[PDB]
Amino acid sequence: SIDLSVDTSEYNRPLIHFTPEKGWMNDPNGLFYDKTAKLWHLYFQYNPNATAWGQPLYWGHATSNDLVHWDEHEIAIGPEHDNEGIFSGSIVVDHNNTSGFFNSSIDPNQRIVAIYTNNIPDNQTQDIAFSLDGGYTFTKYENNPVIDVSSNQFRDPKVFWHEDSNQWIMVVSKSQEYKIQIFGSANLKNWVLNSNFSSGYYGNQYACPGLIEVPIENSDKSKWVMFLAINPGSPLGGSINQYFVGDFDGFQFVPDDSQTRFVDIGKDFYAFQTFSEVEHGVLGLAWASNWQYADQVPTNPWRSSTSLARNYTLRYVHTNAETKQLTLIQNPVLPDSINVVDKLKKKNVKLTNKKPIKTNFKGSTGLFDFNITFKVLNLNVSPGKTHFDILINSQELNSSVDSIKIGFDSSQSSFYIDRHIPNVEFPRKQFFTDKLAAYLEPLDYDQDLRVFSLYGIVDKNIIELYFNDGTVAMTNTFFMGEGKYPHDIQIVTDTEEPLFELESVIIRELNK
Amino acid sequence: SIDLSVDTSEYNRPLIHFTPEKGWMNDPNGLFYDKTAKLWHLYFQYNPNATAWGQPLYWGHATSNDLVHWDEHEIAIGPEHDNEGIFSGSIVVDHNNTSGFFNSSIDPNQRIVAIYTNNIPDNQTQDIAFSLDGGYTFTKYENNPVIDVSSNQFRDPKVFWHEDSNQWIMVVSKSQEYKIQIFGSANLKNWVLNSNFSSGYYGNQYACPGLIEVPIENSDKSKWVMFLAINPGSPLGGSINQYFVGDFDGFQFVPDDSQTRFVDIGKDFYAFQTFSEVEHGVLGLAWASNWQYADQVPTNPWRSSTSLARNYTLRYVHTNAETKQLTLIQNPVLPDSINVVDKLKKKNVKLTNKKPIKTNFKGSTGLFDFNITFKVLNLNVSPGKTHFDILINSQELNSSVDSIKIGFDSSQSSFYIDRHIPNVEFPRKQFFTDKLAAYLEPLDYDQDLRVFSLYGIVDKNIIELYFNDGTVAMTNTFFMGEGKYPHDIQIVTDTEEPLFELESVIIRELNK
Ligand SMILES: OC[C@H]1O[C@@](CO)(OC[C@@]2(OC[C@@]3(OC[C@@]4(O[C@H]5O[C@H](CO)[C@@H](O)[C@H](O)[C@H]5O)O[C@H](CO)[C@@H](O)[C@@H]4O)O[C@H](CO)[C@@H](O)[C@@H]3O)O[C@H](CO)[C@@H](O)[C@@H]2O)[C@@H](O)[C@@H]1O
Ligand SMILES: OC[C@H]1O[C@@](CO)(OC[C@@]2(OC[C@@]3(OC[C@@]4(O[C@H]5O[C@H](CO)[C@@H](O)[C@H](O)[C@H]5O)O[C@H](CO)[C@@H](O)[C@@H]4O)O[C@H](CO)[C@@H](O)[C@@H]3O)O[C@H](CO)[C@@H](O)[C@@H]2O)[C@@H](O)[C@@H]1O
Ligand SMILES: *[C@@H]1O[C@H](CO)[C@@H](O)[C@H](O)[C@H]1NC(C)=O
Ligand SMILES: *[C@@H]1O[C@H](CO)[C@@H](O)[C@H](O)[C@H]1NC(C)=O
Ligand SMILES: *[C@@H]1O[C@H](CO)[C@@H](O)[C@H](O)[C@H]1NC(C)=O
């Protein structure tokens, strides 16, 4: 329950990634859109008292109108005793007052209900609560709990309105049984078990499930996508998110196939949840850290940001050369309401060790982005050189420039990050992986030449990569030395002839 | 046509992990046991002409009687033209001469047939060949190929005798279709397609499938285990091996569940195949490297070792605290026929920063092993110290000691490796991951205290870890600076009080 005189925001706090002002944030909760206030809501696992996870545990709260300018508000929910906690959960908007909390004086689009896990010593139940003031203060049902199965491991329900079966659906995790459980109710108070679902990578625990209809691109058609988070025992170490693509009738999810696929192959993307009430598309964000080392990272007086919100679709994409697969695609949310401080733009440039691309901006905000489409040429080079790299350098402090690398190796058809930074030591950095990669097929062939694309956005302590137009995404935090934060960006290579042609490049400085 | 005057065997060549004398080895092939010659056979993807994969491509050959003393022989098989290559494949012993290559003058346990992929420009077929001299020289069938489906991506068949359906089974990969294909035949020459199987992690390509009956421990019973290799696009990067546990009838494999589980969560364990004719148990080995950087590692004039052979069983193990899962267990093969040069043995020792455990041996062979059971005590310590570490140090050369770390963090319940070594730079080391971890549940509770176990064996350039009696295995290569190789081994910690009790410890110097 510490805190104090040390503040790293100067070089550590992201600008456009939500962050609690002080304390501890994990799982994002109760994500919804308020159509009449035209307002986006975000709640979160919050321990105000400590720089680490502890009880009592609360739902934090903050709103946005644009999904990058967050305003923090007073806590939406707390537990009865210091002994307990309001765990993960969701929100729904009860338009037709099936729940009966709702007067005639309350806008249908403001009839908010939260379903959350109530965690007691030796007990975990599914409880609900309602807000009369547009989501800012809540009243416990009164006959809570609404679901109790005598379990110590039963938590994190996402709830939604299924037209087709005419009910409220609940995906909640029977955590250590590796079941996602599917309840139905016409009521939000009375619940009937419909089915259990076990699949994908098991890890140590199922958690924060999610089920939602995601639109196939360029088409009337859609599919039903089951999200699932697992910690610990991610094959990458710690925590991760995964999905399955199939069909829901309101009683059981049937995956089209039985493959395992991950939502984000970065290290720091856990407890993804989608927004309720989104008119057009599927939108979500996650908790942008890994349970292996989240509580030891060198930020103070808060810890943890969220990811950007992302737009989710399904696209037929090439996973090898012969076969395409229906595949979850995600792209970041950036409204024009974001200042461009300065930018470097370039067209049809050949990359060689004598033509680097050096950002030369006046000063820095630590919020950059980069948008690149490239062609891989026919030119044979020695194996050490079949790569180009983006270096994201800090300003020189103790006469030393902290940098992180993002490259692509044509011989490997795979992008890569190296987030190693020397002299920055914190507890559990044995699990803080420095090198990760993603294999991708060409976005396109221009003749015989291969074409790849990548958008990345750096934010003081977090970096998001989207490969080939959002075919794979890779979230990862990074910790530079005290006082240092991104200043400039380079795109370099060791080859003397051009191996890569950059069709388009746009490096941007950004702001609030 | 490179090779020359540079030889690293002095500090790089493993002693008990098979290695070709010179050239390039990947997938191990045709693994079988010769009951009459009481002799173990290993074949492999071999390019004798280069330090990298190239055609013409051959099956190499070597035998052993103890599975750690390897004798290299003349090539067992080659292609017709420099244009082509004998790809991966297996061997069976045709006892009852169903194939008809076999006289009365040939021992039933020497009636060898190889089934291998014949790779032609634009064609890949399933071909077969027999040996009359106990596996040393082969004759192509004559009406080869025996399976052709007009495919450019159709390779790597494992074959076996199914009593219960009275036929020869073939698991072969339709590589870019993500199908494992199951053919049956009474003949080995005529083949009928029985089923297709698609599951687990897809990656870019299915490869080197395997199906076999593995015995459940302490029981009459067994299960049918489907192995699969995938490269590229292992979630860890590059290449990896995975499995599924279910039931075979001779026509289709049905997995009990639909989960994804990996055979070795290390970075260098691909193209696992099991031995034919083993009387008692399932035994196998893999190619001990990753396709991301195998051809760039600093070993000359060979590249690549195999793993040790391992004994494979299924055990009920706790994956969280509530649930156990039927789980592939693997432990290493080490006959007593292995010299113990020297050893340090210890009992019930409390670990603290002042009581380290330093190996003090006369000199070094670079072949060490270590066998450790431990208890995690009730003692609260600052977060940076909840770990202990095994340091595997080289001798000091340019006044610098190359080391690789293997630890366990009690707060994480997870083991870890850090194979970083400074100043050693080679092509594609961007993909050469340095930090990897494995989360495990206790092996046993002694009272309330937790008990974990780990055997690891180092061999000049490779390290194999088996956690909690073979519940998870982690294979990884390592490349120390020119001339440097393991010399001594420490077990240290930073804590002042004992956090770990080492029930038993046995560090060993080993030899041929
Ligand atoms: O907020 C509840 C909510 O989150 C979800 C989704 O993640 O699950 C949380 C869950 O696991 C958290 C976990 O790690 C916590 C961690 O440290 C905290 O806990 C310790 C005591 O348990 C404290 O000593 C420490 O100071 C706290 O900060 O545990 C490690 C310490 O060994 C640290 O590395 C982590 O930061 O808790 C267990 C216990 O360690 C871990 O295995 C998890 O990774 O939280 C409860 C129990 O904490 C567990 O049931 C959940 O998995 C979601 O399911 C809930 O809705
Ligand atoms: O020998 C066939 C046998 O092995 C298996 C099981 O692994 O399949 C191997 C397979 O993929 C090989 C792959 O890596 C090779 C690699 O370099 C070699 O190949 C290139 C020729 O295409 C050369 O450029 C290079 O110099 C050779 O050393 O490819 C990369 C070069 O970019 C290097 O990183 C590797 O060392 O080849 C493709 C293309 O890169 C990779 O994606 C693979 O990892 O072999 C063929 C093609 O080589 C492919 O069909 C196989 O999947 C087994 O299935 C076979 O029975
Ligand atoms: C689902 O699991 C619950 C909890 O184990 C159990 O009571 C119920 O039998 C299951 N129902 C179905 C349909 O599988
Ligand atoms: C990046 O470039 C493409 C090409 O114009 C553009 O459509 C896209 O919106 C840009 N920004 C992002 C975040 O993808
Ligand atoms: C398996 O897939 C192949 C590829 O077309 C097809 O010919 C075959 O009919 C399928 N067989 C079965 C039994 O499903």
PDB file of N, CA and C in Angstrom, chain B residues 328-383:
ATOM      1  N   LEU B 328       1.570 -36.762 -21.967  1.00  0.00           N
ATOM      2  CA  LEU B 328       2.794 -37.379 -22.457  1.00  0.00           C
ATOM      3  C   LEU B 328       3.965 -37.015 -21.583  1.00  0.00           C
ATOM      4  N   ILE B 329       4.571 -38.062 -21.036  1.00  0.00           N
ATOM      5  CA  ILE B 329       5.781 -38.016 -20.224  1.00  0.00           C
ATOM      6  C   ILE B 329       6.919 -38.579 -21.063  1.00  0.00           C
ATOM      7  N   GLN B 330       8.100 -37.961 -20.969  1.00  0.00           N
ATOM      8  CA  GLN B 330       9.296 -38.433 -21.652  1.00  0.00           C
ATOM      9  C   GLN B 330      10.517 -38.275 -20.763  1.00  0.00           C
ATOM     10  N   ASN B 331      11.314 -39.344 -20.650  1.00  0.00           N
ATOM     11  CA  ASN B 331      12.578 -39.323 -19.876  1.00  0.00           C
ATOM     12  C   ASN B 331      13.721 -39.841 -20.730  1.00  0.00           C
ATOM     13  N   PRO B 332      14.967 -39.369 -20.472  1.00  0.00           N
ATOM     14  CA  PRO B 332      16.103 -39.577 -21.382  1.00  0.00           C
ATOM     15  C   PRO B 332      16.674 -40.976 -21.273  1.00  0.00           C
ATOM     16  N   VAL B 333      17.355 -41.452 -22.317  1.00  0.00           N
ATOM     17  CA  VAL B 333      17.978 -42.782 -22.241  1.00  0.00           C
ATOM     18  C   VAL B 333      19.473 -42.673 -21.901  1.00  0.00           C
ATOM     19  N   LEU B 334      19.846 -43.261 -20.769  1.00  0.00           N
ATOM     20  CA  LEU B 334      21.223 -43.269 -20.327  1.00  0.00           C
ATOM     21  C   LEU B 334      21.617 -44.622 -19.749  1.00  0.00           C
ATOM     22  N   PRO B 335      22.219 -45.498 -20.573  1.00  0.00           N
ATOM     23  CA  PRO B 335      22.613 -46.750 -19.939  1.00  0.00           C
ATOM     24  C   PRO B 335      23.807 -46.541 -19.009  1.00  0.00           C
ATOM     25  N   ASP B 336      23.994 -47.498 -18.106  1.00  0.00           N
ATOM     26  CA  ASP B 336      25.178 -47.518 -17.231  1.00  0.00           C
ATOM     27  C   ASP B 336      26.472 -47.566 -18.042  1.00  0.00           C
ATOM     28  N   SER B 337      26.367 -47.921 -19.324  1.00  0.00           N
ATOM     29  CA  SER B 337      27.556 -47.952 -20.200  1.00  0.00           C
ATOM     30  C   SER B 337      28.219 -46.550 -20.403  1.00  0.00           C
ATOM     31  N   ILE B 338      27.774 -45.559 -19.607  1.00  0.00           N
ATOM     32  CA  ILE B 338      28.306 -44.183 -19.657  1.00  0.00           C
ATOM     33  C   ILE B 338      29.184 -43.937 -18.464  1.00  0.00           C
ATOM     34  N   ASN B 339      30.457 -43.644 -18.747  1.00  0.00           N
ATOM     35  CA  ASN B 339      31.440 -43.285 -17.738  1.00  0.00           C
ATOM     36  C   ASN B 339      30.945 -42.164 -16.839  1.00  0.00           C
ATOM     37  N   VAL B 340      31.075 -42.341 -15.538  1.00  0.00           N
ATOM     38  CA  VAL B 340      31.054 -41.211 -14.630  1.00  0.00           C
ATOM     39  C   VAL B 340      32.510 -40.809 -14.381  1.00  0.00           C
ATOM     40  N   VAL B 341      32.918 -39.667 -14.911  1.00  0.00           N
ATOM     41  CA  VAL B 341      34.292 -39.218 -14.672  1.00  0.00           C
ATOM     42  C   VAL B 341      34.509 -38.771 -13.224  1.00  0.00           C
ATOM     43  N   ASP B 342      33.589 -37.968 -12.701  1.00  0.00           N
ATOM     44  CA  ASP B 342      33.642 -37.422 -11.343  1.00  0.00           C
ATOM     45  C   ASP B 342      32.228 -36.995 -11.025  1.00  0.00           C
ATOM     46  N   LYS B 343      31.908 -36.866  -9.740  1.00  0.00           N
ATOM     47  CA  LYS B 343      30.612 -36.318  -9.349  1.00  0.00           C
ATOM     48  C   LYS B 343      30.550 -35.693  -7.959  1.00  0.00           C
ATOM     49  N   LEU B 344      29.681 -34.699  -7.836  1.00  0.00           N
ATOM     50  CA  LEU B 344      29.322 -34.081  -6.569  1.00  0.00           C
ATOM     51  C   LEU B 344      27.897 -34.546  -6.192  1.00  0.00           C
ATOM     52  N   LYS B 345      27.787 -35.116  -4.990  1.00  0.00           N
ATOM     53  CA  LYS B 345      26.524 -35.586  -4.414  1.00  0.00           C
ATOM     54  C   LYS B 345      26.216 -34.859  -3.108  1.00  0.00           C
ATOM     55  N   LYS B 346      24.963 -34.392  -2.968  1.00  0.00           N
ATOM     56  CA  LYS B 346      24.530 -33.717  -1.725  1.00  0.00           C
ATOM     57  C   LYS B 346      23.106 -34.033  -1.268  1.00  0.00           C
ATOM     58  N   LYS B 347      22.877 -33.892   0.045  1.00  0.00           N
ATOM     59  CA  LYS B 347      21.631 -34.330   0.706  1.00  0.00           C
ATOM     60  C   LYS B 347      21.061 -33.239   1.606  1.00  0.00           C
ATOM     61  N   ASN B 348      19.737 -33.090   1.568  1.00  0.00           N
ATOM     62  CA  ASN B 348      19.003 -32.157   2.432  1.00  0.00           C
ATOM     63  C   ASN B 348      19.702 -30.813   2.714  1.00  0.00           C
ATOM     64  N   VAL B 349      20.198 -30.122   1.676  1.00  0.00           N
ATOM     65  CA  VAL B 349      20.874 -28.809   1.861  1.00  0.00           C
ATOM     66  C   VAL B 349      20.007 -27.566   1.661  1.00  0.00           C
ATOM     67  N   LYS B 350      20.183 -26.616   2.570  1.00  0.00           N
ATOM     68  CA  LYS B 350      19.444 -25.369   2.580  1.00  0.00           C
ATOM     69  C   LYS B 350      20.227 -24.382   1.714  1.00  0.00           C
ATOM     70  N   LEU B 351      19.524 -23.759   0.759  1.00  0.00           N
ATOM     71  CA  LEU B 351      20.133 -22.799  -0.152  1.00  0.00           C
ATOM     72  C   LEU B 351      20.039 -21.366   0.344  1.00  0.00           C
ATOM     73  N   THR B 352      21.194 -20.708   0.384  1.00  0.00           N
ATOM     74  CA  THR B 352      21.285 -19.293   0.718  1.00  0.00           C
ATOM     75  C   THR B 352      22.511 -18.768   0.021  1.00  0.00           C
ATOM     76  N   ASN B 353      22.593 -17.441  -0.102  1.00  0.00           N
ATOM     77  CA  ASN B 353      23.692 -16.788  -0.823  1.00  0.00           C
ATOM     78  C   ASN B 353      25.080 -17.081  -0.300  1.00  0.00           C
ATOM     79  N   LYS B 354      25.173 -17.569   0.932  1.00  0.00           N
ATOM     80  CA  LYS B 354      26.486 -17.933   1.475  1.00  0.00           C
ATOM     81  C   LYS B 354      26.850 -19.409   1.333  1.00  0.00           C
ATOM     82  N   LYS B 355      25.843 -20.270   1.160  1.00  0.00           N
ATOM     83  CA  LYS B 355      26.048 -21.699   0.883  1.00  0.00           C
ATOM     84  C   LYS B 355      25.849 -22.039  -0.595  1.00  0.00           C
ATOM     85  N   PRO B 356      26.727 -21.548  -1.494  1.00  0.00           N
ATOM     86  CA  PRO B 356      26.511 -22.003  -2.856  1.00  0.00           C
ATOM     87  C   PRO B 356      26.957 -23.463  -3.026  1.00  0.00           C
ATOM     88  N   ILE B 357      26.763 -24.017  -4.215  1.00  0.00           N
ATOM     89  CA  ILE B 357      27.158 -25.388  -4.531  1.00  0.00           C
ATOM     90  C   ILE B 357      28.070 -25.301  -5.747  1.00  0.00           C
ATOM     91  N   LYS B 358      29.378 -25.284  -5.537  1.00  0.00           N
ATOM     92  CA  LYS B 358      30.317 -25.176  -6.657  1.00  0.00           C
ATOM     93  C   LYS B 358      30.929 -26.519  -6.993  1.00  0.00           C
ATOM     94  N   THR B 359      30.784 -26.916  -8.246  1.00  0.00           N
ATOM     95  CA  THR B 359      31.448 -28.072  -8.789  1.00  0.00           C
ATOM     96  C   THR B 359      32.937 -27.774  -8.761  1.00  0.00           C
ATOM     97  N   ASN B 360      33.706 -28.687  -8.169  1.00  0.00           N
ATOM     98  CA  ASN B 360      35.160 -28.588  -8.160  1.00  0.00           C
ATOM     99  C   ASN B 360      35.796 -29.878  -8.697  1.00  0.00           C
ATOM    100  N   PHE B 361      35.779 -30.018 -10.023  1.00  0.00           N
ATOM    101  CA  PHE B 361      36.288 -31.181 -10.738  1.00  0.00           C
ATOM    102  C   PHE B 361      37.686 -30.911 -11.253  1.00  0.00           C
ATOM    103  N   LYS B 362      38.429 -31.988 -11.512  1.00  0.00           N
ATOM    104  CA  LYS B 362      39.817 -31.881 -11.963  1.00  0.00           C
ATOM    105  C   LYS B 362      39.936 -31.126 -13.308  1.00  0.00           C
ATOM    106  N   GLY B 363      39.141 -31.554 -14.305  1.00  0.00           N
ATOM    107  CA  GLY B 363      39.066 -30.910 -15.645  1.00  0.00           C
ATOM    108  C   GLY B 363      37.697 -31.112 -16.298  1.00  0.00           C
ATOM    109  N   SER B 364      37.570 -30.865 -17.614  1.00  0.00           N
ATOM    110  CA  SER B 364      36.245 -31.010 -18.275  1.00  0.00           C
ATOM    111  C   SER B 364      36.146 -31.708 -19.645  1.00  0.00           C
ATOM    112  N   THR B 365      35.048 -32.444 -19.799  1.00  0.00           N
ATOM    113  CA  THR B 365      34.711 -33.130 -21.034  1.00  0.00           C
ATOM    114  C   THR B 365      33.578 -32.436 -21.796  1.00  0.00           C
ATOM    115  N   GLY B 366      32.941 -31.470 -21.128  1.00  0.00           N
ATOM    116  CA  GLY B 366      31.815 -30.719 -21.679  1.00  0.00           C
ATOM    117  C   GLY B 366      30.537 -31.532 -21.701  1.00  0.00           C
ATOM    118  N   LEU B 367      30.579 -32.700 -21.077  1.00  0.00           N
ATOM    119  CA  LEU B 367      29.380 -33.480 -20.929  1.00  0.00           C
ATOM    120  C   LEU B 367      29.018 -33.570 -19.453  1.00  0.00           C
ATOM    121  N   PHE B 368      28.076 -32.754 -19.004  1.00  0.00           N
ATOM    122  CA  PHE B 368      27.613 -32.821 -17.616  1.00  0.00           C
ATOM    123  C   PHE B 368      26.162 -33.213 -17.523  1.00  0.00           C
ATOM    124  N   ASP B 369      25.751 -33.655 -16.351  1.00  0.00           N
ATOM    125  CA  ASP B 369      24.332 -33.833 -16.079  1.00  0.00           C
ATOM    126  C   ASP B 369      24.062 -33.420 -14.624  1.00  0.00           C
ATOM    127  N   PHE B 370      22.796 -33.164 -14.291  1.00  0.00           N
ATOM    128  CA  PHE B 370      22.435 -32.733 -12.935  1.00  0.00           C
ATOM    129  C   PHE B 370      21.048 -33.183 -12.592  1.00  0.00           C
ATOM    130  N   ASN B 371      20.887 -33.708 -11.392  1.00  0.00           N
ATOM    131  CA  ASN B 371      19.662 -34.367 -11.021  1.00  0.00           C
ATOM    132  C   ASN B 371      19.248 -33.826  -9.649  1.00  0.00           C
ATOM    133  N   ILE B 372      18.113 -33.117  -9.595  1.00  0.00           N
ATOM    134  CA  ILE B 372      17.742 -32.323  -8.415  1.00  0.00           C
ATOM    135  C   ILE B 372      16.279 -32.482  -7.999  1.00  0.00           C
ATOM    136  N   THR B 373      16.073 -32.843  -6.731  1.00  0.00           N
ATOM    137  CA  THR B 373      14.762 -32.743  -6.101  1.00  0.00           C
ATOM    138  C   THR B 373      14.831 -31.602  -5.082  1.00  0.00           C
ATOM    139  N   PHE B 374      13.763 -30.817  -4.957  1.00  0.00           N
ATOM    140  CA  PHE B 374      13.765 -29.688  -4.027  1.00  0.00           C
ATOM    141  C   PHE B 374      12.426 -29.346  -3.394  1.00  0.00           C
ATOM    142  N   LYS B 375      12.515 -28.700  -2.233  1.00  0.00           N
ATOM    143  CA  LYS B 375      11.348 -28.263  -1.468  1.00  0.00           C
ATOM    144  C   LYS B 375      11.299 -26.733  -1.424  1.00  0.00           C
ATOM    145  N   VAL B 376      10.117 -26.167  -1.684  1.00  0.00           N
ATOM    146  CA  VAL B 376       9.939 -24.724  -1.505  1.00  0.00           C
ATOM    147  C   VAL B 376       9.336 -24.415  -0.113  1.00  0.00           C
ATOM    148  N   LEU B 377      10.124 -23.676   0.670  1.00  0.00           N
ATOM    149  CA  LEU B 377       9.812 -23.409   2.061  1.00  0.00           C
ATOM    150  C   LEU B 377       8.863 -22.223   2.216  1.00  0.00           C
ATOM    151  N   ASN B 378       8.325 -22.069   3.430  1.00  0.00           N
ATOM    152  CA  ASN B 378       7.558 -20.888   3.826  1.00  0.00           C
ATOM    153  C   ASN B 378       8.434 -19.836   4.428  1.00  0.00           C
ATOM    154  N   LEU B 379       8.861 -18.910   3.574  1.00  0.00           N
ATOM    155  CA  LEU B 379       9.734 -17.802   3.944  1.00  0.00           C
ATOM    156  C   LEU B 379       9.456 -16.675   2.951  1.00  0.00           C
ATOM    157  N   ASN B 380       9.104 -15.514   3.473  1.00  0.00           N
ATOM    158  CA  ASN B 380       8.730 -14.407   2.629  1.00  0.00           C
ATOM    159  C   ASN B 380       9.968 -13.624   2.267  1.00  0.00           C
ATOM    160  N   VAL B 381      10.179 -13.432   0.971  1.00  0.00           N
ATOM    161  CA  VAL B 381      11.324 -12.666   0.539  1.00  0.00           C
ATOM    162  C   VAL B 381      10.955 -11.606  -0.511  1.00  0.00           C
ATOM    163  N   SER B 382      11.815 -10.596  -0.650  1.00  0.00           N
ATOM    164  CA  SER B 382      11.608  -9.523  -1.610  1.00  0.00           C
ATOM    165  C   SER B 382      11.576 -10.119  -3.027  1.00  0.00           C
ATOM    166  N   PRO B 383      10.667  -9.620  -3.908  1.00  0.00           N
ATOM    167  CA  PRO B 383      10.307 -10.216  -5.210  1.00  0.00           C
ATOM    168  C   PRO B 383      11.467 -10.546  -6.141  1.00  0.00           C
TER     169      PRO B 383
END
